[PDB]
Amino acid sequence: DNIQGITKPAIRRLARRGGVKRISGLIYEETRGVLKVFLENVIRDAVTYTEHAKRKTVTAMDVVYALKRQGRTLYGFG
Amino acid sequence: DNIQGITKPAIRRLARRGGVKRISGLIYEETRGVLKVFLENVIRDAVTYTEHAKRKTVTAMDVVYALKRQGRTLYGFG
Amino acid sequence: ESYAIYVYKVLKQVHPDTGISSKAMSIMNSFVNDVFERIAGEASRLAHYNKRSTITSREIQTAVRLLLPGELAKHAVSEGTKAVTKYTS
Amino acid sequence: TRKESYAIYVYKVLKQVHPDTGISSKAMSIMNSFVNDVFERIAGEASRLAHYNKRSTITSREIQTAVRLLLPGELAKHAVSEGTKAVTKYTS
Amino acid sequence: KTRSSRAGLQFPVGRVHRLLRKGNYAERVGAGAPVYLAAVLEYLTAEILELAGNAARDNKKTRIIPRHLQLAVRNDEELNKLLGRVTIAQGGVLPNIQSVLLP
Amino acid sequence: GGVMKPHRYRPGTVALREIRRYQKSTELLIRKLPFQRLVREIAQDFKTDLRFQSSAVMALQEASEAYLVALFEDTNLCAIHAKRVTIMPKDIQLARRIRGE
Amino acid sequence: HRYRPGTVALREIRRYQKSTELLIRKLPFQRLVREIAQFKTDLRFQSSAVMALQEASEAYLVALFEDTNLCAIHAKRVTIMPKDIQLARRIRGE
């Protein structure tokens, strides 16, 4: 149960960066669920690429390719 | 002013298809503006494709390619 | 040329006594073309990432697994594997 | 093993548009990513166009069409101007 | 004999092979690629047509119409995900009314 | 002695009836000739003396009708979230903003 | 001495929009990833991969919360509520 490691202070800080002034007490579970879904999708794609590549190690380029597949296009990691 | 040809009851009809019960009096102009912008973009792309093809007639396949470029695939006019 | 006759031959196997309109036929033609383009482009990317000249059944399978949803992808892979096995056996 | 990059070229450009200005390694990597991304976009659009008109050769005309389709507003105009100027000077 | 007969499929393998060799996707193609792709296409087509026929029989009709294709695709969990960004001409929408509007 | 009329529909009833009526069918909702004139007019701004295909215009009409239908579908959700029955331009703007337009 | 409710909230908003650091702790995130990566047993990871995942996740969450705040404001509320997130994700197309 490592999803509880995304702590309430962390989510509050992220919201603050988002421009939220007042936060309800029920936001954190929904945020945890959403983060879990997003990470699951990306990691599934990354693992798919790795298995096709015949690699034990998941490389960063694989993560980039998954994000490009889903339409995020992260810069700064090659 | 052919934009006025998009009649008030026509917009009401589109809304009814969408599932709107009560329509405000300014929805119509806003929809006129939105539709104008959208058509302008699509037509610009289509005419670009045509002029690249050296044609004077605007084929339907050009409209299809333009809509694909926007990211709205259309089945039927292939 | 198009896939019309092939669509018919498929249609008659899953619904004998039915018909289909020309507009529906064109829609299916577009759908076949679209799926083919998607899968082919994905396979071409995959073959580029590993710097390999050839697209293989493995490449197509990778593309299918990436592109389709799960329950659909599993059946797709099963059918493709059965077909490619029968092709040689 | 050696690998290709764009760092020196970007630095030469920067030294032309800002004689006194440094750039961090992270920024250089981001710029490499941007250059690669734009190159891929333009090239793929050009191939798609070249396929639509059944042409074996991608020429400057297809590239210009691709750029015009892909860049918004006056940026496309300036891009076309620069490319045309460069080609014209290239011929002579 | 035709490769489809060997593979037991219905879509033509050879035309797919020619399209791959012609559509500028790579330098080479393995013998098995077209057969696999044809099998996938046949399976997807059969699925779509089965759902379309079921939708048609549900309305006492014998000819599949674009509205039926729309209902079949949108009334499925995974096909809708696969065709989320596709607009079907003469397709229409799904009948539904928000519960806060009914009296 | 006079001719008494029976009654008047409660408001919204016929609106819902029209909602069902237009959701059941699949047809073009926009006046075709005005639409063609509008397309021609706005196309004149990119290349003078153009010519169109009938299907090229039918496709444009289809795409536009679908786009507007989706926009209204999201806008109705926006309005409902605002606890309103009437639909407002601000809801349209919010829908476009969140969608990314 | 106390700062009135919301003042320190604005102070945090300003300072965290000014800053560019990461907000989520690396070790919990790495544990989460390596836990939900069990798809293929006994996997190995480059650090840069986890760094890119963290970056993308924080960016996605920030982008989502922006629309959440927009919705809440549209609802004439200061406090964000889960229904706002649900509306944002519904309109966004997820």
Side-chain angles (χ1 to χ4, degrees):
Chain A
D1 185 1
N2 292 320
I3 192 65
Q4 291 299 327
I6 307 304
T7 63
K8 171 163 67 178
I11 300 168
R12 176 173 294 276
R13 289 189 298 269
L14 285 174
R16 291 281 189 255
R17 177 168 284 186
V20 178
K21 186 181 180 182
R22 199 166 157 109
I23 308 177
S24 170
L26 297 172
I27 307 292
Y28 306 100
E29 297 296 327
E30 184 72 14
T31 309
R32 288 188 183 88
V34 175
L35 178 62
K36 185 174 175 63
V37 172
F38 179 79
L39 285 174
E40 280 180 359
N41 292 317
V42 177
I43 287 173
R44 181 182 298 110
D45 300 332
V47 171
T48 307
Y49 275 101
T50 302
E51 287 181 349
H52 177 76
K54 309 193 189 83
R55 272 189 281 91
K56 297 294 192 300
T57 305
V58 174
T59 63
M61 295 299 296
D62 301 327
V63 181
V64 177
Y65 287 155
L67 290 174
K68 185 184 294 182
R69 179 60 174 277
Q70 288 188 10
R72 305 293 181 174
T73 314
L74 180 64
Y75 285 177
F77 296 101
Chain B
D1 291 328
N2 287 318
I3 191 67
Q4 294 298 324
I6 306 306
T7 67
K8 200 267 204 76
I11 301 171
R12 180 184 293 283
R13 205 172 300 110
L14 288 168
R16 287 279 192 259
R17 178 176 288 271
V20 177
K21 188 176 181 178
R22 190 168 158 101
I23 310 179
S24 177
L26 299 173
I27 306 298
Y28 309 93
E29 299 289 334
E30 182 67 22
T31 307
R32 285 191 184 88
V34 172
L35 178 63
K36 183 172 69 66
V37 171
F38 176 78
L39 287 171
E40 278 182 0
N41 291 317
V42 177
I43 286 291
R44 182 175 64 253
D45 282 322
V47 173
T48 307
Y49 275 106
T50 308
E51 287 185 359
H52 175 66
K54 293 175 175 285
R55 288 187 291 265
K56 301 185 184 185
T57 64
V58 175
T59 69
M61 290 300 296
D62 301 326
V63 178
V64 175
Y65 290 156
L67 288 170
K68 183 177 179 180
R69 179 62 179 272
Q70 264 73 242
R72 297 179 180 85
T73 308
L74 183 63
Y75 288 174
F77 298 92
Chain C
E1 295 186 337
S2 57
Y3 300 97
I5 189 166
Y6 299 103
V7 167
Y8 278 111
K9 283 180 177 178
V10 172
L11 179 57
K12 293 292 180 182
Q13 292 181 354
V14 298
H15 289 282
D17 57 357
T18 184
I20 183 171
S21 62
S22 63
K23 301 296 181 180
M25 185 59 68
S26 295
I27 293 170
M28 293 295 295
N29 204 161
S30 294
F31 175 79
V32 170
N33 285 315
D34 183 3
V35 172
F36 171 81
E37 287 185 357
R38 289 181 181 180
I39 295 175
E42 196 55 18
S44 190
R45 298 177 173 182
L46 266 294
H48 185 73
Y49 286 163
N50 296 332
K51 298 201 290 288
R52 289 296 184 189
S53 309
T54 314
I55 296 169
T56 67
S57 65
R58 183 179 177 85
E59 303 303 344
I60 307 289
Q61 182 179 4
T62 308
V64 167
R65 285 189 298 174
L66 284 170
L67 184 62
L68 297 177
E71 194 67 18
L72 190 63
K74 287 187 294 188
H75 291 88
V77 169
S78 299
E79 289 289 341
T81 306
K82 185 170 69 65
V84 70
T85 306
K86 290 185 177 181
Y87 180 77
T88 56
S89 298
Chain D
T1 301
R2 304 173 65 175
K3 185 170 65 179
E4 293 178 330
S5 182
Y6 294 101
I8 187 166
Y9 307 116
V10 170
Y11 196 65
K12 284 183 174 182
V13 170
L14 180 67
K15 279 297 189 73
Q16 286 189 0
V17 77
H18 286 282
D20 52 1
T21 301
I23 180 167
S24 57
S25 301
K26 304 282 101 173
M28 190 62 72
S29 295
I30 293 165
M31 287 295 293
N32 286 314
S33 298
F34 175 81
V35 168
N36 287 320
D37 179 77
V38 174
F39 170 83
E40 286 186 352
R41 289 181 179 177
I42 296 173
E45 190 55 29
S47 189
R48 187 180 297 111
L49 288 169
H51 188 67
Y52 280 164
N53 297 335
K54 290 192 177 65
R55 286 292 186 273
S56 294
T57 316
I58 294 168
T59 74
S60 59
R61 186 169 182 270
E62 292 78 14
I63 302 287
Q64 179 180 358
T65 309
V67 170
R68 187 174 295 170
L69 278 173
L70 190 141
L71 297 176
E74 192 69 11
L75 190 61
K77 299 290 186 178
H78 288 293
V80 170
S81 302
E82 289 292 339
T84 306
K85 184 171 65 178
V87 172
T88 302
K89 289 189 180 178
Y90 182 71
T91 307
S92 66
Chain E
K1 53 169 70 66
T2 63
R3 286 181 274 186
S4 299
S5 62
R6 284 192 177 87
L9 300 176
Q10 293 296 328
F11 286 163
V13 172
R15 287 177 56 182
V16 180
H17 191 205
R18 187 177 71 154
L19 287 176
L20 288 173
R21 285 184 277 105
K22 186 261 287 183
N24 294 114
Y25 295 98
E27 187 177 29
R28 295 190 173 192
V29 178
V35 176
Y36 199 93
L37 182 50
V40 173
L41 291 174
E42 183 172 4
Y43 174 74
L44 292 173
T45 304
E47 183 68 20
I48 295 288
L49 290 176
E50 178 61 19
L51 290 176
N54 292 328
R57 292 190 299 171
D58 295 328
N59 293 323
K60 189 186 291 186
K61 294 293 189 296
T62 58
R63 296 176 65 251
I64 302 170
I65 61 175
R67 172 56 180 274
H68 292 167
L69 289 172
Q70 188 71 26
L71 290 176
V73 173
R74 291 290 184 271
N75 287 323
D76 184 80
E77 184 179 2
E78 292 183 352
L79 293 173
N80 191 4
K81 186 181 293 182
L82 180 62
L83 299 171
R85 300 286 83 193
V86 177
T87 298
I88 296 171
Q90 298 296 330
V93 298
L94 295 175
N96 51 5
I97 298 172
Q98 298 298 321
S99 71
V100 296
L101 297 173
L102 298 173
Chain F
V3 177
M4 66 286 194
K5 61 187 179 65
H7 216 67
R8 192 185 199 172
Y9 267 142
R10 297 292 177 271
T13 313
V14 180
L16 292 170
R17 184 178 295 173
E18 292 179 354
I19 285 170
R20 275 184 77 187
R21 178 257 188 84
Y22 285 113
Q23 283 186 355
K24 183 177 74 65
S25 63
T26 61
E27 62 185 357
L28 294 173
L29 275 63
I30 298 178
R31 294 296 109 204
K32 302 177 64 174
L33 269 67
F35 184 81
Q36 182 172 31
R37 287 201 297 268
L38 178 64
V39 172
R40 290 191 195 278
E41 184 175 4
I42 62 171
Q44 282 181 351
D45 298 333
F46 297 102
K47 182 64 182 300
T48 58
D49 193 5
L50 284 174
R51 194 180 288 183
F52 291 149
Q53 278 188 348
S54 51
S55 295
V57 175
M58 291 175 70
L60 288 171
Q61 189 170 1
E62 287 286 335
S64 299
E65 285 186 353
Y67 174 79
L68 291 175
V69 168
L71 181 63
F72 274 108
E73 283 179 354
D74 289 350
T75 315
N76 193 0
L77 292 175
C78 291
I80 291 171
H81 184 75
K83 302 205 293 296
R84 274 185 286 89
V85 184
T86 309
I87 184 178
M88 298 301 179
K90 59 187 293 183
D91 299 331
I92 299 169
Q93 292 179 357
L94 181 76
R96 290 184 68 189
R97 179 66 179 84
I98 299 174
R99 184 181 295 177
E101 297 178 356
Chain G
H1 180 285
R2 288 182 59 90
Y3 283 108
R4 196 167 296 166
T7 302
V8 185
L10 293 172
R11 191 177 300 160
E12 290 181 357
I13 289 168
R14 284 193 288 272
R15 85 164 72 264
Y16 279 107
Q17 287 185 355
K18 186 173 70 65
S19 63
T20 61
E21 64 182 2
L22 299 168
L23 289 307
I24 297 173
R25 310 303 182 179
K26 294 182 272 65
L27 275 63
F29 187 79
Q30 172 179 325
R31 286 199 299 275
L32 179 66
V33 169
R34 289 178 186 265
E35 181 177 359
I36 65 173
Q38 297 175 352
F39 290 153
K40 183 64 179 299
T41 60
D42 187 359
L43 277 173
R44 197 169 298 259
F45 289 87
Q46 288 176 337
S47 57
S48 65
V50 174
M51 292 175 70
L53 286 174
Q54 185 173 14
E55 284 291 351
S57 302
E58 285 195 346
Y60 173 77
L61 289 174
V62 172
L64 181 63
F65 269 112
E66 284 184 1
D67 293 335
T68 302
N69 197 3
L70 287 176
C71 293
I73 293 170
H74 180 76
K76 302 195 294 185
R77 277 185 284 94
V78 185
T79 309
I80 59 173
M81 296 179 180
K83 49 187 172 183
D84 299 332
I85 302 166
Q86 290 178 355
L87 181 73
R89 292 183 65 253
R90 180 65 175 82
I91 299 171
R92 190 185 298 270
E94 293 180 356

